[PDB]
Design a protein around this ligand. Structure first.
Ligand code: CA
Ligand code: CA
Lengths: 25, 19, 144
């Protein structure tokens, strides 16, 4: 079952996206 | 400014929403 | 430490580190994003990696990846920044913003919010249902 891994991948990209939008603001 | 501010709020909401 | 948590983070790391050298490059981070329908620019991919790249060597290793996963939105300045991002649209300085004014700005501006995503946001942001969002309290709720 790959689903927990995939959910974690999505969360990690959203963390990166959040951290960049914070740097840019 | 407005766009980078919208970006931050959007990104924060979509992260909070992963749960 | 238990191998429960070790399991999911290692597997997740491997989905990025497809070449298995122990590090996530911009090319690999971008590949994963593109495979999820995203179209990042290389500049975006660099900026992302630079936010968690402790040793400045330009890629993400496993400790950096774990550290990032744990940190989430707990960064000390995260409430200040997100809340200051709110103030921008709070014309009057009360610390409040109308629901309607939040949905306006959220939907209209860049990285536009889905009509669903904004519906969920407002339902969590206006707890009274009067149309007034104490955005500090909202930010304090998002920032665990
Ligand atoms: Ca690699
Ligand atoms: Ca590194």
């Amino acid at each position: 079952d790959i689903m927990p891994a995939v959910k974690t991948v999505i969360r990690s990209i959203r963390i990166l996206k959040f951290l960049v939008a914070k740097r840019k603001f | 400014r407005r766009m980078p501010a919208a970006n931050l709020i959007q990104a924060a909401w979509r992260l909070y929403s992963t749960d | 430490l238990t191998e429960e948590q070790i399991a999911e983070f290692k597997e997740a790391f491997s989905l990025f580190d497809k070449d298995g050298d122990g590090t996530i490059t911009t090319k690999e981070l971008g590949t994963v994003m593109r495979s999820l329908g995203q179209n990042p620019t290389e500049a975006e991919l660099q900026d992302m990696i630079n936010e968690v790249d402790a040793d400045g060597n330009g890629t993400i290793d496993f400790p950096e990846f774990l550290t990032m996963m744990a940190r989430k939105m707990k960064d000390t300045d995260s409430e200040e920044e997100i809340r200051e991002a709110f103030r921008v649209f709070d014309k009057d300085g009360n610390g409040y913003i109308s629901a309607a004014e939040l949905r306006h700005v959220m939907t209209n501006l860049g990285e536009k919010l889905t009509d669903e995503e904004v519906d969920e946001m407002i339902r969590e942001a206006d707890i009274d249902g009067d149309g007034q969002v104490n955005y500090e309290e909202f930010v304090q709720m998002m920032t665990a």
